[PDB]
Symmetry: C5
Subunit: 214 residues, 5 copies
Amino acid sequence: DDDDKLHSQANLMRLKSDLFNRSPMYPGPTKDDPLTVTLGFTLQDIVKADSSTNEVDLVYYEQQRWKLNSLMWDPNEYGNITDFRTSAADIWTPDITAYSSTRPVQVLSPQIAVVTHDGSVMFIPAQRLSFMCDPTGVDSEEGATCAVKFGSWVYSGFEIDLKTDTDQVDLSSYYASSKYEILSATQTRQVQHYSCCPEPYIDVNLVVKFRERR
Amino acid sequence: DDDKLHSQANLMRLKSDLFNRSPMYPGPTKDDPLTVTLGFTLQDIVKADSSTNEVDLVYYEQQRWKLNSLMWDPNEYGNITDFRTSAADIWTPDITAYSSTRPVQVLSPQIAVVTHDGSVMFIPAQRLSFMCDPTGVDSEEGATCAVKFGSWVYSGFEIDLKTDTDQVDLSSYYASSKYEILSATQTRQVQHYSCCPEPYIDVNLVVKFRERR
Amino acid sequence: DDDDKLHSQANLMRLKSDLFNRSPMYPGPTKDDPLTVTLGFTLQDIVKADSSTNEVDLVYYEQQRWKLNSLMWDPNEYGNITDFRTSAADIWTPDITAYSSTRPVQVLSPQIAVVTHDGSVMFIPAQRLSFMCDPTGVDSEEGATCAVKFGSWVYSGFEIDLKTDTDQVDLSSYYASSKYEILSATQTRQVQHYSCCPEPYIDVNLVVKFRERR
Amino acid sequence: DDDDKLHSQANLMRLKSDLFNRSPMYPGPTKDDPLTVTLGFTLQDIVKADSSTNEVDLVYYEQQRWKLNSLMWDPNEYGNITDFRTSAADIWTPDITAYSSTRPVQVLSPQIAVVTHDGSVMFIPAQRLSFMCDPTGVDSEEGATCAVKFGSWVYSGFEIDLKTDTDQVDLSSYYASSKYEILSATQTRQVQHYSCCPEPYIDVNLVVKFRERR
Amino acid sequence: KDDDDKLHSQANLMRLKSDLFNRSMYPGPTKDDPLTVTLGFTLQDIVKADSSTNEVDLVYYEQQRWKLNSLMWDPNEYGNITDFRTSAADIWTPDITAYSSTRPVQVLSPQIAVVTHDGSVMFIPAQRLSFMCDPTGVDSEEGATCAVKFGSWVYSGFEIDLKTDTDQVDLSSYYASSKYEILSATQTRQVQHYSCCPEPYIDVNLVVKFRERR
Ligand SMILES: Clc1ccc([C@H]2C[C@@H]3CC[C@H]2N3)cn1
Ligand SMILES: Clc1ccc([C@H]2C[C@@H]3CC[C@H]2N3)cn1
Ligand SMILES: Clc1ccc([C@H]2C[C@@H]3CC[C@H]2N3)cn1
Ligand SMILES: Clc1ccc([C@H]2C[C@@H]3CC[C@H]2N3)cn1
Ligand SMILES: Clc1ccc([C@H]2C[C@@H]3CC[C@H]2N3)cn1
């Protein structure tokens, strides 16, 4: 049964080939082919809050899900391969960007996604973000409140739509011994209009109330 | 399903037919001058280091230009009016801050939008450290600083700049920033440099600011 | 005279060619072809502990080992070459990622591995890591305790399995005059489940007890 | 004129393709075929003088100019194209290096150079340099005084020679409101010798005298 | 006259280089076919000693020297070309790495090496290194004392050997005005053994004894 191993790999190498070098590179969404990306935020730590610049440093991971008929296949032609991991470079990925960011976002996780036979893609980049947020109040019972919104930078609402599965930011993995404890963190979808462009823009707005321990 | 398949067969076609045959339109020439429109939305003045006289801004810079070479007719492609593309896939203008003091930091996806008339728009969100003496930032008057943005390699006869208005966009300036803005103006300038015979256009960003109170 | 050197080289260039550029795959692990990676940690220095952000900086090396039938050769027909060094780019390498990390990991070693005729691969990246770690207690007899877990970020337990050779993290090479002395450092295998995914995920958890030297 | 821009381009695209793609790119100067770069500095600002490490940070741009015969063409064979801009990684560029630098040089500007028909090339990289410089006295009448030498790292005086246009640094762009006032800034050709190598090495010595701006 | 002579000299060096790389190739040292690098340090400056992390930052240049068969030519087929400069990435270079480093080494110089007709290569990368080093006592008569060993990361004592030209580090270029005076600096050949692997590994041990100025 090392022969069995060899087939499962002949097949995966074939599925991947037939997908990525047959009808090459899906060109991103268009008005005519809109795409909805599901966003979820696991907040792990509020690393730093610089009260003299009003920047705050978060480490989270952001879970992204979309679906593409172009990534669809029947397992029964690929030997019951239901899914597979691939390089995030190998496929179109959504350009989800933090709007109040103040340094380039730092990737903490491997650039790899998982594609399923229904053409559904899931991708979870863990990131360190520095964003505009005024920590005044972080040492009072009330704490301080901060927001940062995540959305497509280039695609409108007619091209990319966003939706969350839940309002509650995942705090189950929040670092126990963090300098700051979480009081609430909500992921909410929003529409904004910008002075650049006629169309609306979907973002998911992350709102975090927090304070120092003791 | 079916209709989706076509509008992507088309997009893959347009993209292909454009970027191949002239892989690289090779940039402007005196023969083929190009004007790029600049706008600045100021988001935040993060930091003002009075000990080094560096100031830190976070803004985004909106760039627009036009290229016959990116021109196409919607009816050739099933009414595709425009599309998103990688910023590496196309020629982009080399707009550089002149009094910058650290490499500019890109905060946005490197992607642009191309329209059927061959007009391109691109908006890099940037964090900039530039030369600026914040003395006065703690007085009613505040402190004034300037930093000029312009092509680094292309002259006025190759790239020209113009702004659609002189007021820097402050509608999205951070409400709880350490510094409040008093005025921010984007104005076109001509300078000459000791390096080169021809004139060089820059858009000069002028910002008066003071500490929030 | 010197001709012998020339053969050993023709033959290494041949083995490498026949392996890499006459492919037959390696697409990474799948359920049908699971892979077990051996992890070992040599802890070199606790560089910094920042009490105000609850971040700690470690310098270690991470010894990885796996096996691949696809990298297997009969040395007889390659001038009796038993192994060779290759660029880590030139092969599939496991995506072993620190979960509590707070800045991207810093590579301190050459991006090179050694492959043996049995298809066994060993790769030891030296790294600087910053992770969520609360140093409170670092200046008491007891010291402070911190954990960081290392695992595949994208491959589950059905694709990648992890195993240590020993529970003892290697302190042989730990800096003598480091700001912090180690009181124990244990590498222990674990299974977690995550909100993202149906299947379990293996990680090796590094647990470090430390305090300020005298 | 639609076509009068298609021709201009096809020519430039072909011109470039003739010089690099079709031509074997020039292997740097030799003792047998030497080369003179002409260096110039525009000093823009002394950003930081750190008297706890004796590092000073300058921001300046360095005008570089050399002539290559491999880079000559006939504007008659390319629709009268007297010159063009191209990326610095398409051509050979001199390795002019700061000798007393303490942090790898930071590029403030795009990596693009201008080539003219007679083969002359100009390159103006803008940079930030941390170099070894005791700033004691920077708060007195007479100020402090600092040197940093630029010159080829690898090529000696028989491969690369240096010229300046003038031994006055370009203070025309010095930041009027800089922490530091410039008192003098001179650039001078020099010959050194080092242990490594038997020939002499040519540098241009930048010497700044400055004080904290009253 | 000279226009032709410099077109010949170039065509030969263009040819010679394309003879050595674009044909004839060298896959690093083997036990079969070993190699000795000769290391030498010119220490230039101790920039920073951070007593809060026990990190020291040196700025030095490292002279590397090895000899390769695959790199020999006869100047009479290549018009008396005794040597040439070429990019480090066109030839094999040793992976001499700092063992006690805390931050990835920073390259202060261009990556170009010199190859002579007898196959010998010289490569002098200039570097900024942060390494593990308790600087206590640095403000006393007797100062502090620190070691950092450089040596191959992957290659054993049977693939790469090391030798130094002298046990004295070059302080003839030490920054006369640095925050730290050097009291001694010696480079010493050493053999280590590690858990990971069976054979000896050779390093050169750099040992610096230093104090703050006055
Ligand atoms: Cl494609 C993808 C992204 C993220 C993940 C997650 C599952 C485990 C836990 C976090 C991360 N690793 C799994 N797969
Ligand atoms: Cl190419 C492009 C088009 C539009 C934009 C803008 C839309 C969202 C909000 C500001 C910025 N991102 C940015 N880039
Ligand atoms: Cl290749 C090149 C040509 C010209 C220039 C110059 C244009 C602006 C002003 C001085 C410098 N930057 C810079 N680089
Ligand atoms: Cl390949 C090579 C040869 C020589 C050098 C040296 C010559 C000058 C002085 C030190 C360094 N720069 C550096 N690299
Ligand atoms: Cl492929 C490989 C082999 C061996 C090693 C190790 C042996 C010496 C000590 C640490 C590192 N260098 C690291 N990587």
